[PDB]
């Protein structure tokens, strides 16, 4: 038997420092979690104990906090290099700052292979990106070799800005010939490492002949065997077992997000590279694990430059600003109401009364226990993308279809669920998709006293929304296709920041803007 320990992270999203349990800024250091210093301690402890170890990342290191806004990936190359990651697969957020934002800060500076087998470069770009990422890497581990084959979401063109020169093939189509090539090179132990979501990961496990294990990301999937150590509810056992079409049991793993957990899988291989068994569980990187002092001091050095975004108080909150995915993708969330109220307040300076906002665009909560203080740093984790809040004119029919889209596949923690302003929507999830909106009232504009009236299909409404939605992001194709007017607006973070400074003390409530009917 030959035992391999796979350590893995995914969707770290710029949480270089330790954080609160909800992955927002660490205030009470006594109960903080994650961060690269604490992760280092845990990894080193495992490397001391186990002779055959791989530390892998399944993408989306890019984007999430002021670390990325300021260092733009240089912090990722630096601290991943310091942690001695063995390999990384490209995620969609690695393309947020174009191909040049991936090439210069990360690809040219990483000391570990960066992988994607389903990304093919064309035109002038093909010439200089050659060699900076690889379809696979064969890694020596003890007296053996392990093949790692990469993959990135085929949907990346729609999720990010990878440009016109990169082609994203179907993951299964692209993976099979690379796995077959590795098998002809006598590599009998193969890990598929990539960034497409748990559903695609299970499909890769089922269909790509020769993959022994799948390490994934993108869906922030939490898997656990037994009693979970924190608030994340398991979506399945760890590892999640898939029976392949050629009859093999293939473990599929993922480790939630934000560096809160370290994924840990032990695989028992035979001499021909068959998986005899596997077991493990994600390790909660809580305060019981000490933060490595060398890494922590280097984090404290890089932290100096970021304190310009922490010293200015924009305002105060006396309520928890719930920007969690568990709230904002399933129900009305007070962070969504705050952001929509700021959006409407900004354009009103009777003009435009309605706001829609994809809940998945709210990327972090903000805690009120830090003497209620809100800084640019706190808001930057909520709104990291540098988008704008645009003015659009829609038909009632278009809006009805958008609200049907908001809940068409409700229950999967998808970002399309809409947060609102100037709208009172009631859904009935017992009804079929496309017919779940049972009430949709909107604030009148052509009235001297604003009040709620039923939306009319043949009428025209002005809505403030992110450019992400005006461009048909999150499958809101009907908005881009059917809109009547589209005016570009102010930068998202500046809109909210200005609103918080005007109000001084905020207390946004959940107040019945979105409801679900029991009957």
Give the C-alpha separation, 139 to 115, whole Å: 13
Phi, psi values for residue 400, rounded to 5°: -60, -45
Give the C-alpha separation, 74 to 246, whole Å: 43
The reply on whether position 273 binds Ca ion by CB under 5 A is: yes
Taking the least distance from each CB to a second copy, the nearer of 44 and 494 is: 494
Q: Is 389 annotated as a binding residue?
A: no
- Binding to ligand KYW by CB under 6 A, coded x per residue (else -) over 271-310, reads ----------------------------------------
Helices of type H across 29-154 = 36-49, 66-71, 74-83, 100-102, 125-129
Look up residue 226 and give its two tokens.
């037994």
The reply on whether position 358 binds ligand KYW by CB under 6 A is: yes
- Binding to a second copy by CB under 8 A, coded x per residue (else -) over 349-388, reads xxx----------------x--------------------
Taking the least distance from each CB to a second copy, the nearer of 138 and 510 is: 510
Question: Which residue in the set 194, 466, 489, 508 belongs to the binding site for ligand KYW (CB under 6 A)?
Answer: 466
Q: What is the dihedral of CA 339, 344, 347, 349, to 10 degrees?
A: -100
Task: Indicate which of ligand KYW, Zn ion, a second copy, none lies near residue 160 (CB less than 5 to 8 Å, by partner kind).
Answer: ligand KYW
The reply on whether position 305 binds a second copy by CB under 8 A is: no
Starting at the edge strand found earlier in the chain, the sheet holding 437-443 runs: 452-454, 437-443, 423-427, 514-516
Give the C-alpha separation, 490 to 389, whole Å: 6
Residue 31 CB coordination number (10 Å): 12
The reply on whether position 92 binds ligand KYW by CB under 6 A is: yes
Taking the least distance from each CB to a second copy, the nearer of 131 and 512 is: 512
**CA distances (Å), origin 293, targets 1, 41, 297:** 37, 9, 6
Taking the least distance from each CB to ligand KYW, the nearer of 147 and 361 is: 361
DSSP state of 31: G
The reply on whether position 251 binds Ca ion by CB under 5 A is: no
Residue 397, SS3?
A: helix
Taking the least distance from each CB to Zn ion, the nearer of 216 and 251 is: 216
Taking the least distance from each CB to a second copy, the nearer of 320 and 385 is: 320
Q: Which residues pair with 141 in a beta bridge?
A: 144
Question: Which residue in the set 8, 218, 401, 424 belongs to the binding site for Zn ion (CB under 5 A)?
Answer: 218
3-state helix, strand, coil in the chain (%, to 5): 30, 30, 40
Give the binding range for Zn ion (CB under 5 A) out of 10-18, 223-231, 321-329, 404-412.
10-18
Please report how close the Cβ of residue 211 comes to Ca ion at its closest, in angstroms: 8
Rg (CA), the chain: 24
Taking the least distance from each CB to ligand KYW, the nearer of 372 and 421 is: 421
**CA distances (Å), origin 62, targets 26, 65, 379:** 20, 9, 17
- Binding to a second copy by CB under 8 A, coded x per residue (else -) over 324-353, reads ----------x-------------xxxx--
Q: Is 481 annotated as a binding residue?
A: no
Using CB under 6 A as the binding rule, the residues of this chain from 381 to 400 that contact ligand KYW are 385, 387
Question: Could you give the count of Cα atoms lying within 13 Å of 362 in the half-sphere of its Cβ?
Answer: 35
Taking the least distance from each CB to ligand KYW, the nearer of 228 and 386 is: 386
Please report how close the Cβ of residue 424 comes to a second copy at its closest, in angstroms: 7
Q: Is 195 annotated as a binding residue?
A: yes
Residue 39, SS3?
A: helix
Give the binding range for a second copy (CB under 8 A) out of 29-37, 225-233, 312-320, 482-490.
312-320
Please report how close the Cβ of residue 354 comes to a second copy at its closest, in angstroms: 12
Residue 177, SS3?
A: helix
Q: Is 143 annotated as a binding residue?
A: no
Taking the least distance from each CB to ligand KYW, the nearer of 92 and 337 is: 92
The reply on whether position 439 binds a second copy by CB under 8 A is: no
Phi, psi values for residue 370, rounded to 5°: -80, 50
Phi, psi values for residue 198, rounded to 5°: -55, -35
Q: Is 186 annotated as a binding residue?
A: no
The reply on whether position 216 binds ligand KYW by CB under 6 A is: no
Q: What is the dihedral of CA 134, 135, 140, 146, to 10 degrees?
A: 160
Q: What is the dihedral of CA 29, 32, 37, 43, to 10 degrees?
A: 140
The answer to whether 418 and 333 are in contact (CB under 8 A) is: no
The reply on whether position 212 binds ligand KYW by CB under 6 A is: no
The reply on whether position 318 binds a second copy by CB under 8 A is: yes
Give the C-alpha separation, 359 to 356, whole Å: 9
Q: Is 346 annotated as a binding residue?
A: no
User: Which residues line the annotated binding site?
Assistant: 11, 13, 60, 92, 195, 218, 329, 358, 363, 385, 468, 474
| Binding site residues, Ca ion, CB under 5 A | 188, 212, 273
Binding site for a second copy (CB under 8 A): 318-320, 322, 334, 348-351, 368, 424, 443, 448-452, 502-505, 507-512
Residues that bind Zn ion (CB under 5 A): 11, 60, 91-92, 218
């Amino acid at each position: 038997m030959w035992e391999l320990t796979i350590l893995h992270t995914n969707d770290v999203h710029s949480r270089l420092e330790q954080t609160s349990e909800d992955s927002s800024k660490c205030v009470d250091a006594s109960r903080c979690m994650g961060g690269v210093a604490r992760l280092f301690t845990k990894v080193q402890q495992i490397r001391r104990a186990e002779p055959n170890v791989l530390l892998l990342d399944a993408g989306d290191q890019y984007q999430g906090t002021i670390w990325f806004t300021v260092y733009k990936g240089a912090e990722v190359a630096h601290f991943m290099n310091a942690l001695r990651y063995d390999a990384m697969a490209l995620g969609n957020h690695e393309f947020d700052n174009g191909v040049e934002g991936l090439i210069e800060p990360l690809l040219k500076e990483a000391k570990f292979p960066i992988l994607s087998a389903n990304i093919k470069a064309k035109g002038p770009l093909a010439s200089q990106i050659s060699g900076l990422y690889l379809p696979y890497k064969v890694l020596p581990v003890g007296d053996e070799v392990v093949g790692i084959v990469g993959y990135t979401s085929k949907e990346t063109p729609f999720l990010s800005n990878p440009g016109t020169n990169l082609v994203f093939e179907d993951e299964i189509t692209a993976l099979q010939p690379e796995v077959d090539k590795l098998k002809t090179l006598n590599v009998n132990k193969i890990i598929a490492l990539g960034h497409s979501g748990f559903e695609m990961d299970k499909l890769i496990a089922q269909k790509v002949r020769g993959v022994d294990v799948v390490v994934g990301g993108h869906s922030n999937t939490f898997l656990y065997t037994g009693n979970p150590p924190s608030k994340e509810v398991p979506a399945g056992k760890y590892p999640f077992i898939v029976t392949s079409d050629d009859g093999r049991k293939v473990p599929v793993v993922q480790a939630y997000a934000f560096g809160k957990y370290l994924g840990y899988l032990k695989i028992e291989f035979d001499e021909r590279g068959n998986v005899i068994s596997s077991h493990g569980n994600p390790i909660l990187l809580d305060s019981s694990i000490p933060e490595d002092p060398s890494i922590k001091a280097d984090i404290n050095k890089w932290r100096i430059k970021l304190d310009d975004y922490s010293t200015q108080e924009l305002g105060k909150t006396i309520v928890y600003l719930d920007g969690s995915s568990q709230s904002c993708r399933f129900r009305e969330c007070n962070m969504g109401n705050l952001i929509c109220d700021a959006m409407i307040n900004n354009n009103l300076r009777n003009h435009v009364s309605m706001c829609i906002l994809n809940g998945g665009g709210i990327r972090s909560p903000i805690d009120e226990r830090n003497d209620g203080t809100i800084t640019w740093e706190n808001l930057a984790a909520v709104l990291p993308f540098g988008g704008t809040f645009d003015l659009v004119q829609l038909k009632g029919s278009t809006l009805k279809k958008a609200f049907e889209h908001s809940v068409h596949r409700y229950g999967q923690s998808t970002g399309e669920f809409l947060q609102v302003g100037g709208i009172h929507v009631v859904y009935d999830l017992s009804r079929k998709p496309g017919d779940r909106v049972v009430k949709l009232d909107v604030l009148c504009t052509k009235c001297r006293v604003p009040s709620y009236d039923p939306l009319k299909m043949d009428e025209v409404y002005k809505v403030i929304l992110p450019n992400f939605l005006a461009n048909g992001g999150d499958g809101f194709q009907m908005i881009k296709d059917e809109l009547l007017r589209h005016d570009s607006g102010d930068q998202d973070i500046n809109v909210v920041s200005t609103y918080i400074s005007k109000m001084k003390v905020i207390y946004p409530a959940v107040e019945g803007r979105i409801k679900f009917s029991l009957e």
